[PDB]
PDB file of N, CA and C in Angstrom:
ATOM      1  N   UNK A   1    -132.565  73.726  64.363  1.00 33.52           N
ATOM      2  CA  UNK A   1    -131.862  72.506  64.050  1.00 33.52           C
ATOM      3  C   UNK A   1    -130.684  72.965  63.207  1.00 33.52           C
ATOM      4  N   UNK A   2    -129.165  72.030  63.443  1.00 35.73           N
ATOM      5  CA  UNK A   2    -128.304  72.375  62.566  1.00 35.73           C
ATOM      6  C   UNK A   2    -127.650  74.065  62.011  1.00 35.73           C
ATOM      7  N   UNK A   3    -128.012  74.839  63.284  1.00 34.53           N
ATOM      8  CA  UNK A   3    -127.738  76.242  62.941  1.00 34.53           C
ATOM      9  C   UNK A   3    -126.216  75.738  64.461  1.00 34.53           C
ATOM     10  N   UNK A   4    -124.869  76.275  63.544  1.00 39.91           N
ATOM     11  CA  UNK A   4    -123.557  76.191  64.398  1.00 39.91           C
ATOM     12  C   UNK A   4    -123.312  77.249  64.878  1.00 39.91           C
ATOM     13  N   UNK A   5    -122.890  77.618  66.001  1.00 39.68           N
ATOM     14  CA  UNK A   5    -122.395  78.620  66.576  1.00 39.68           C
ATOM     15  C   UNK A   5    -120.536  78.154  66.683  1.00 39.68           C
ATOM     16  N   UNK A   6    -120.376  79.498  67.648  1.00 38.93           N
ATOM     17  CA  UNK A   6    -118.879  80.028  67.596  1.00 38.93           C
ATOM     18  C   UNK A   6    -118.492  79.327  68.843  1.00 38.93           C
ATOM     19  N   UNK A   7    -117.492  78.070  69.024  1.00 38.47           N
ATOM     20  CA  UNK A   7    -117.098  77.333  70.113  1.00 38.47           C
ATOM     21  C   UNK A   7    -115.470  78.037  70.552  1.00 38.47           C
ATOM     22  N   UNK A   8    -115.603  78.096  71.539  1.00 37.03           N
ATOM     23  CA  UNK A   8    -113.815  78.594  72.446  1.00 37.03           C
ATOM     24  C   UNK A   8    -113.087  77.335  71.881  1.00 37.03           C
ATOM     25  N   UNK A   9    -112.199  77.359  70.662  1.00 36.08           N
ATOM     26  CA  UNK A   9    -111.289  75.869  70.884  1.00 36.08           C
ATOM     27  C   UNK A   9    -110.142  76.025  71.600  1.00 36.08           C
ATOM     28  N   UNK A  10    -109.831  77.032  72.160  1.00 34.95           N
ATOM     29  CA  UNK A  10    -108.729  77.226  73.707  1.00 34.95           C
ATOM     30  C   UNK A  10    -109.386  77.961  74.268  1.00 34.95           C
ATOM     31  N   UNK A  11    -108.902  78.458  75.939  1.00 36.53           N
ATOM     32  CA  UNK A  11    -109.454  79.501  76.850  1.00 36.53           C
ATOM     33  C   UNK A  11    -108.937  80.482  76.014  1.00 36.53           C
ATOM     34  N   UNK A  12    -109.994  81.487  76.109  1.00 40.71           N
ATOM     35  CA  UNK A  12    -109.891  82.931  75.312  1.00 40.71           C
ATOM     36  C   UNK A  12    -109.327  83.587  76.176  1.00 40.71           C
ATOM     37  N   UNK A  13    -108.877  84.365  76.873  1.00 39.64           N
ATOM     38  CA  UNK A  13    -108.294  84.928  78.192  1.00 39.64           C
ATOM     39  C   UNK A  13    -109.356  86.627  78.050  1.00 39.64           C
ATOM     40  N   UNK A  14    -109.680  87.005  79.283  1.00 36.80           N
ATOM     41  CA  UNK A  14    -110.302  88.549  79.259  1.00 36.80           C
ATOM     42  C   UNK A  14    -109.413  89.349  78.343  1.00 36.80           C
ATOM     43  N   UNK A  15    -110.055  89.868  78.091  1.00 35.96           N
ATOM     44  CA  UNK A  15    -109.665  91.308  77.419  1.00 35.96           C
ATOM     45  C   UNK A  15    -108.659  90.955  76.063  1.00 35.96           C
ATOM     46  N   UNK A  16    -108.736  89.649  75.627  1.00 35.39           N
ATOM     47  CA  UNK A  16    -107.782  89.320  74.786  1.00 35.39           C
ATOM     48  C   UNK A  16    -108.568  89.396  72.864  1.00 35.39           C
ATOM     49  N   UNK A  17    -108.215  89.924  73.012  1.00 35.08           N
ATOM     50  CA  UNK A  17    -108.226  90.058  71.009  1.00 35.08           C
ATOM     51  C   UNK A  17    -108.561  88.550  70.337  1.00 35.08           C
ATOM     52  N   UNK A  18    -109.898  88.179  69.665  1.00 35.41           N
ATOM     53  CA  UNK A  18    -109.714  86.921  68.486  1.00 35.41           C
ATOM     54  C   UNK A  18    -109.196  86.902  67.464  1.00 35.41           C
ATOM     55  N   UNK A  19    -108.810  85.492  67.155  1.00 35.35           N
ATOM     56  CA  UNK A  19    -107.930  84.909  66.148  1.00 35.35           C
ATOM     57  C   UNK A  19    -108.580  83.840  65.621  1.00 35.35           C
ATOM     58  N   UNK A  20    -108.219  83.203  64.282  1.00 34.61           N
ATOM     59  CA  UNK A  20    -109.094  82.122  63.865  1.00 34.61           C
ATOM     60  C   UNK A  20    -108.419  80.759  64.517  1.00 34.61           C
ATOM     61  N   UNK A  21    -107.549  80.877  65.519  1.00 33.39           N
ATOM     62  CA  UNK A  21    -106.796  79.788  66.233  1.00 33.39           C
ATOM     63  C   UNK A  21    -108.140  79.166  67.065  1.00 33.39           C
ATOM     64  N   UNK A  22    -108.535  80.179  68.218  1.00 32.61           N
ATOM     65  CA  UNK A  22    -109.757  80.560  68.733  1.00 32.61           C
ATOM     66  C   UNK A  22    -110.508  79.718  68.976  1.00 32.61           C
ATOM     67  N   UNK A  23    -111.399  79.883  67.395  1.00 35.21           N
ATOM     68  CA  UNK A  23    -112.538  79.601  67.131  1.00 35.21           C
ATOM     69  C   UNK A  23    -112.994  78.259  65.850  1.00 35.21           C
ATOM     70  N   UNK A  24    -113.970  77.717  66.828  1.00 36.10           N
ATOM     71  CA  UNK A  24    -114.366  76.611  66.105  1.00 36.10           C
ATOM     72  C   UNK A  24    -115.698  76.673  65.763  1.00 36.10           C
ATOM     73  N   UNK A  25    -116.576  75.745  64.754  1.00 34.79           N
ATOM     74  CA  UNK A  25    -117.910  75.851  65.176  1.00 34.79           C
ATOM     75  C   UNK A  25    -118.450  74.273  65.148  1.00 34.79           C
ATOM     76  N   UNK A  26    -119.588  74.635  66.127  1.00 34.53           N
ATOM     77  CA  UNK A  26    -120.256  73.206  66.058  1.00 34.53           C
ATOM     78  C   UNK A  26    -122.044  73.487  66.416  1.00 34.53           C
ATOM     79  N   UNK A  27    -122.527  72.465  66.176  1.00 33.05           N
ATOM     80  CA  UNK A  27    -123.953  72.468  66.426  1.00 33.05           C
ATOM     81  C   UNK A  27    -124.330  72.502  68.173  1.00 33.05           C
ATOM     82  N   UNK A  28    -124.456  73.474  68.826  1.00 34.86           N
ATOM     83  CA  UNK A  28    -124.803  73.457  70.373  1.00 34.86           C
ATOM     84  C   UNK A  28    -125.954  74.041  70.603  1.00 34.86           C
ATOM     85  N   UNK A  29    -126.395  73.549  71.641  1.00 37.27           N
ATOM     86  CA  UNK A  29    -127.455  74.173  72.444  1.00 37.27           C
ATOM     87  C   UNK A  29    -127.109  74.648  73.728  1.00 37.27           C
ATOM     88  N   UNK A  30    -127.477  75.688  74.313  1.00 36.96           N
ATOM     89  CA  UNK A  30    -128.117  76.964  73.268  1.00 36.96           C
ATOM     90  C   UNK A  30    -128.044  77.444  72.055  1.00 36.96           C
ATOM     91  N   UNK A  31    -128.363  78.033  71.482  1.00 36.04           N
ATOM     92  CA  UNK A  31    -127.362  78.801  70.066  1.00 36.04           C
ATOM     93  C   UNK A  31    -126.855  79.429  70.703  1.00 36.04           C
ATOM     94  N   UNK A  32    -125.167  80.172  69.911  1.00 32.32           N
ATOM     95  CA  UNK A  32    -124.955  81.176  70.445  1.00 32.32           C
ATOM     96  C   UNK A  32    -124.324  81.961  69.531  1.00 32.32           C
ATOM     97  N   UNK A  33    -123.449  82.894  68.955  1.00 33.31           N
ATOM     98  CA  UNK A  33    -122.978  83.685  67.730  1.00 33.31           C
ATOM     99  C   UNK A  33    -122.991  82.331  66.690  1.00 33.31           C
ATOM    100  N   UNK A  34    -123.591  83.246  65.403  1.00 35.63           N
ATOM    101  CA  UNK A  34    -123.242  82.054  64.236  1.00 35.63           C
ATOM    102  C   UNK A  34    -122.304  81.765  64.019  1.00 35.63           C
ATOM    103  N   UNK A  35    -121.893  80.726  63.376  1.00 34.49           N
ATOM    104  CA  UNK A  35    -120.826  80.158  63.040  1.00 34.49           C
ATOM    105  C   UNK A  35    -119.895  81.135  61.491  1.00 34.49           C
ATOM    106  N   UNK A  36    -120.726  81.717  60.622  1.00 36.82           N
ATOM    107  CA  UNK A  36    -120.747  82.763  59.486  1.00 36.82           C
ATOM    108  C   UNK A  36    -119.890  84.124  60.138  1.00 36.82           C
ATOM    109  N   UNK A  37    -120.195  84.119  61.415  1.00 36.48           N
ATOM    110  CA  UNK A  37    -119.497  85.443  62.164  1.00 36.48           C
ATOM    111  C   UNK A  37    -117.989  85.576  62.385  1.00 36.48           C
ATOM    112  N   UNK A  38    -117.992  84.030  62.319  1.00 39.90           N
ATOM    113  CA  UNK A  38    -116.205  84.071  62.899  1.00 39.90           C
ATOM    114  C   UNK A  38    -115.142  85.151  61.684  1.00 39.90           C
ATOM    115  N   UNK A  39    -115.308  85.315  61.033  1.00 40.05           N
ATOM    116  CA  UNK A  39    -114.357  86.695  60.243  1.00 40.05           C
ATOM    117  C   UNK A  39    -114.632  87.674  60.962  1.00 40.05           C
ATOM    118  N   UNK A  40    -115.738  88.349  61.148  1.00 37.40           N
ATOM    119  CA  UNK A  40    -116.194  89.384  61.618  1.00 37.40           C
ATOM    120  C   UNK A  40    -115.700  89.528  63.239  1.00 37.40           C
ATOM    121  N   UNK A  41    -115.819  88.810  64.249  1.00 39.30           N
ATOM    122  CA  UNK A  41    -115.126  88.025  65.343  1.00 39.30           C
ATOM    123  C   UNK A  41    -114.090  88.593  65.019  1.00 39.30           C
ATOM    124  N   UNK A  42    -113.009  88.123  64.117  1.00 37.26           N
ATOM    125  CA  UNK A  42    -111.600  88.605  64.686  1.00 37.26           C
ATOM    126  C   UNK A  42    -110.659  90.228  64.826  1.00 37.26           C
ATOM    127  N   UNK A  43    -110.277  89.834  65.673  1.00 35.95           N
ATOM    128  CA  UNK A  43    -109.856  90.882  66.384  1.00 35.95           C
ATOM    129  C   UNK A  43    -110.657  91.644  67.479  1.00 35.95           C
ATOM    130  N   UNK A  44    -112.042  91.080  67.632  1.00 36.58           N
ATOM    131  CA  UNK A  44    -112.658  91.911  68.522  1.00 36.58           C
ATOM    132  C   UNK A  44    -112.063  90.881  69.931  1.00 36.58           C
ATOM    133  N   UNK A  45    -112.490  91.622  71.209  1.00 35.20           N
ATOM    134  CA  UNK A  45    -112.239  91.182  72.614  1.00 35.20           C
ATOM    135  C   UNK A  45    -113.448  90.714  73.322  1.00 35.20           C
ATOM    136  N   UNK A  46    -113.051  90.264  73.941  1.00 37.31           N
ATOM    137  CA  UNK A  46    -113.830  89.329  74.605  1.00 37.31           C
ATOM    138  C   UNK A  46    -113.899  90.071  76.191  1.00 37.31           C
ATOM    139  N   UNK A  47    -115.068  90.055  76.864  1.00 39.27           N
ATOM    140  CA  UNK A  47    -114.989  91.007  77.790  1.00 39.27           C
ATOM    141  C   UNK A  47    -115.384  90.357  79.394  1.00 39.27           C
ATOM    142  N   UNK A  48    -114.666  88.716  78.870  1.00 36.61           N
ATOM    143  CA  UNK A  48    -114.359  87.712  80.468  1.00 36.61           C
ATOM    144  C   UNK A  48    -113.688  86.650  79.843  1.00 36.61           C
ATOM    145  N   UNK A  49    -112.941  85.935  80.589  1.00 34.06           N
ATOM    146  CA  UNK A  49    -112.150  84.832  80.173  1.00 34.06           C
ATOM    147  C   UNK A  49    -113.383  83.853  79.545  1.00 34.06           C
ATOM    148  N   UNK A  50    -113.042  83.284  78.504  1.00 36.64           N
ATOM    149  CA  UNK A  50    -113.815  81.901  77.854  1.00 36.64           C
ATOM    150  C   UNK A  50    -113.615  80.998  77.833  1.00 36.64           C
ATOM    151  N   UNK A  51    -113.716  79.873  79.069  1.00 37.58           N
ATOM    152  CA  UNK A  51    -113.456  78.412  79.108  1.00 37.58           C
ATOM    153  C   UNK A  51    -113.335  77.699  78.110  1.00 37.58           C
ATOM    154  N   UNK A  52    -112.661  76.622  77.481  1.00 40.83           N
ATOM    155  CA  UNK A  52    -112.525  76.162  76.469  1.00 40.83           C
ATOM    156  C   UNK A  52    -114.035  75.187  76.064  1.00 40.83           C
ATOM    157  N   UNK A  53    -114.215  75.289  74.990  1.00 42.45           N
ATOM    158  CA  UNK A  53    -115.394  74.437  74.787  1.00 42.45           C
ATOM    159  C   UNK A  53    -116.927  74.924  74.835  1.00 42.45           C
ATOM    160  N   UNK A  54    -116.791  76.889  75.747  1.00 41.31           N
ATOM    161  CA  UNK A  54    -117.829  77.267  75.476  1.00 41.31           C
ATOM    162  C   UNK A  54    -118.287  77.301  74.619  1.00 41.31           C
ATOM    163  N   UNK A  55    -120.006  78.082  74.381  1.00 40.75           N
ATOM    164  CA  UNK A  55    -120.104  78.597  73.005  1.00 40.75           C
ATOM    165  C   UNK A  55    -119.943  80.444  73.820  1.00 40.75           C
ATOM    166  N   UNK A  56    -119.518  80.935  72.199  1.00 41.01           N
ATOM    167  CA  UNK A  56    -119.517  82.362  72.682  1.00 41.01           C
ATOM    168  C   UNK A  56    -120.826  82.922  72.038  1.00 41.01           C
ATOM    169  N   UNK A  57    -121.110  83.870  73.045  1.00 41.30           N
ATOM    170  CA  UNK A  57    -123.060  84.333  73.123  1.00 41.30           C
ATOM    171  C   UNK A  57    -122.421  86.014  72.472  1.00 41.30           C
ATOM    172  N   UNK A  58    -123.038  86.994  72.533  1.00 42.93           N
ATOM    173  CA  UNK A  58    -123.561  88.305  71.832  1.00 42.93           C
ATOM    174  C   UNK A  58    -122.368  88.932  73.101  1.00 42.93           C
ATOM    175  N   UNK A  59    -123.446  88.791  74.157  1.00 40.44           N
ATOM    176  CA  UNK A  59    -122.885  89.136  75.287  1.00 40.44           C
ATOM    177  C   UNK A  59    -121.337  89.372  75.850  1.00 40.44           C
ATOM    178  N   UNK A  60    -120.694  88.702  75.678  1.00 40.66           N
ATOM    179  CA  UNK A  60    -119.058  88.209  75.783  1.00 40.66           C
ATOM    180  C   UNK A  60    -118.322  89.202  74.836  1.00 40.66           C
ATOM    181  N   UNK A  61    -118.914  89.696  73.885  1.00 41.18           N
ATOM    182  CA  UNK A  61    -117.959  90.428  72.616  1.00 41.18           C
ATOM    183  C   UNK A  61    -117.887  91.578  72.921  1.00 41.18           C
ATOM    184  N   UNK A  62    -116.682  93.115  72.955  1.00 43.67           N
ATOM    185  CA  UNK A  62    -116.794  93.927  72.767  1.00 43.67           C
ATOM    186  C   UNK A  62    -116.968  94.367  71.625  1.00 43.67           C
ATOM    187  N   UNK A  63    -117.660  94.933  71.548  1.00 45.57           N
ATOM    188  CA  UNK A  63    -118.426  95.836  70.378  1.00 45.57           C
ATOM    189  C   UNK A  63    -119.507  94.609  69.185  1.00 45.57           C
ATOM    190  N   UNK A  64    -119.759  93.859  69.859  1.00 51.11           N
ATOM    191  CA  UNK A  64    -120.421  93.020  68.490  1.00 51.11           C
ATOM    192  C   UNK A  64    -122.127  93.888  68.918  1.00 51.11           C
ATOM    193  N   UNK A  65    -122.020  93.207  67.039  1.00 50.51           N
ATOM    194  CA  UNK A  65    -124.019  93.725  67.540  1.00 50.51           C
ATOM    195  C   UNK A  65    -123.806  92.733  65.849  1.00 50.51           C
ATOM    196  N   UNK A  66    -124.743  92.341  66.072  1.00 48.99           N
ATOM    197  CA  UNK A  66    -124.918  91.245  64.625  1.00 48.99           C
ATOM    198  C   UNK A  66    -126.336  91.975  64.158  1.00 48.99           C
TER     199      UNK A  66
END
């Protein structure tokens, strides 16, 4: 309950570098990266385009490991 993850607030494009423009957080289901991560998040890439409004999962990040 009430645990936020990391929402696409524009399409992320492949291979493109994060910014705190990016990223939003909100309460979704599934979970998916915490919402606490988004510093850590920036600048890493994203390793497929991210529809706007997803949540972003583990999976999607280059180099994350939480």
């Amino acid at each position: 309950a009430n645990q936020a993850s990391v929402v696409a607030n524009q399409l992320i494009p492949i291979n493109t570098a994060l910014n705190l423009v990016m990223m939003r957080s909100e309460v979704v289901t599934p979970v998916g990266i915490p919402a606490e991560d988004i510093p850590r998040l920036v600048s890493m890439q994203v390793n497929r385009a991210v529809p706007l409004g997803t949540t972003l999962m583990p999976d999607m990040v280059k180099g994350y490991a939480a």
